[PDB]
Amino acid sequence: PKPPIDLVVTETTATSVTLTWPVTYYGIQYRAAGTEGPFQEVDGVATTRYSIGGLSPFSEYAFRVLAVNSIGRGPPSEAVRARTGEQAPSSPPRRVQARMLSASTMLVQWEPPEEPNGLVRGYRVYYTPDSRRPPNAWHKHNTDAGLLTTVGSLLPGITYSLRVLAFTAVGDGPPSPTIQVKTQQGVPAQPADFQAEVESDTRIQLSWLLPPQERIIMYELVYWAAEDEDQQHKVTFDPTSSYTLEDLKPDTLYRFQLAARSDMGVGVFTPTIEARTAQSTPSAPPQKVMCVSMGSTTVRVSWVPPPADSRNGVITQYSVAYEAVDGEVVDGISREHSSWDLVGLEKWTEYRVWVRAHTDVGPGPESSPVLVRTD
Incomplete structure (x- = not known):
């Protein structure tokens, strides 16, 4: 017989395709293009409609039909293309990795999941500073279909845990195994034993422990008056274990943070410490006498x-x-x-x-x- 010619795809789901098109019955032969040569075969289709089930989601197949009568079979029809529907992902993103880009920004990277079951519409990154927290208590950061992203506003001086999941238009997939983000290579550590000692109404000496065997190049001290949060100061100096700030205003509460810079950049700041300068004599007379x-x-x-x-x-x-x-x-x-x-x-x-x-x-x-x- 002659091959059928009006082969048409009528319905498409995630796992099934319905087809419609003097012979005795028809045979539907199909393979995926990028797979192996030998076709799969469905024999004995007595009607002109049929639904092939058991297909994989988001996979491309090729279909062709040949006719058979009492004399024998015929040549197959021209092949038609088809792509199955989407499902939720069944595998997590692959090769998840992370590192600290700055004191508060981490870079996350991954590979697409092996079983997306559809077109990925984005990812959801879950991270926490405390691994003891329940997973749903982690912070969620949504991204697009790219394979890397950045997360800012992190808390400094802490090692984060992280895992990423992918989602298609159907729903979310499973999350990757939890990973730990790496640290900046030559960036120094948060200074330790940071203390402030009031010397007078105008002098405060800061002290800390000098890190052993660490390529320290200079310290950065940032201080400000509590009443003037908008106006802040910064002084840099050669490596040492103590530094005396001078020419401060009397009877003023000051706040302090310290960081360490190497040839690879500045580290995370210390938490804020406070000190109030001693009193002095008044410097102005009464007004409007x-x-x-x-x-x-x-x-x-x-x-x-x-x-x-x-x-x-x-x-x-x-x-x-x-x-x-x-x-x-x-x-x-x-x-x-x-x-x-x-x-x-x-x-x-x-x-x-x-x-x-x-x-x-x-x-x-x-x-x-x-x-x-x-x-």
């Missing part, structure tokens, strides 16, 4: 405390000194006073008056004198 004579022998002096940034400590007391140039000292004034009444002055007499602020360390500078005459 005014003097008024309410009577013939009384003068009222008014002032406001120095600006907060120049007190260098808690103001503990005030002192008033006076001296008359033409005519013939009260300390221990409590910190809550904003005015004090000078009594017993001479009529129509000019005095020189200075106002002064104090900390526990001592007195600061006094304001420029304000002149006032009684009566």
Whole structure:
């Protein structure tokens, strides 16, 4: 007989293909192109429709039909192409690997799974700093169909665990075995025994243990004032086990982090430590000093405390000194006073008056004198 010609693919699933097209019956012969030469055979198809089952998902096959009658068989028809449908992956990604790119960025790489069962639409990377955490408590990072990715915002100084799974449009596949991410080769370790010692109101000496047999090139110290989180400082210096910071502001809380740089870059910073500088004497006088004579022998002096940034400590007391140039000292004034009444002055007499602020360390500078005459 002549081969059938109207061979048409009518339905396609993940594991089955339905085909439709004077003979007695038909035979359906099929092989996958990239496989072995010998075809598989389905014999005795008495109708013009049939559904071939048992196929593998996401696999390309070739189909052809020949006709047979009472005389014998005939040549096969032209071959037609077909690709089975998708399923969820059945194998995890292969050769998963990871390493630290920076102090907080890791690079992850892998190979496609051996059994994707479809077109991969992306991957899901699960990672945790504590392997004791349950698997579903890990952080999930989704990627596209690429075979590598980066994850930032990691916590520094810790070794992560990781495993990746693939998913098609159907669902997720199994996750790979857990792997451990590698470390930067020549990058130094987080400094150990990092301490801060208050030396004075302007000096703080930092100390730590120098790492043994480690190609340290220089240390990087980053510090800032707690009240000025936006403004930070950084000083680099030759390798040592101690460093004294100088010229700091008195009565100021400072925060510190330390890192180590080798020829291969800087390591992870220490956690933040804190220290407050000691107090000093005030560096500015009270502001807005005014003097008024309410009577013939009384003068009222008014002032406001120095600006907060120049007190260098808690103001503990005030002192008033006076001296008359033409005519013939009260300390221990409590910190809550904003005015004090000078009594017993001479009529129509000019005095020189200075106002002064104090900390526990001592007195600061006094304001420029304000002149006032009684009566």
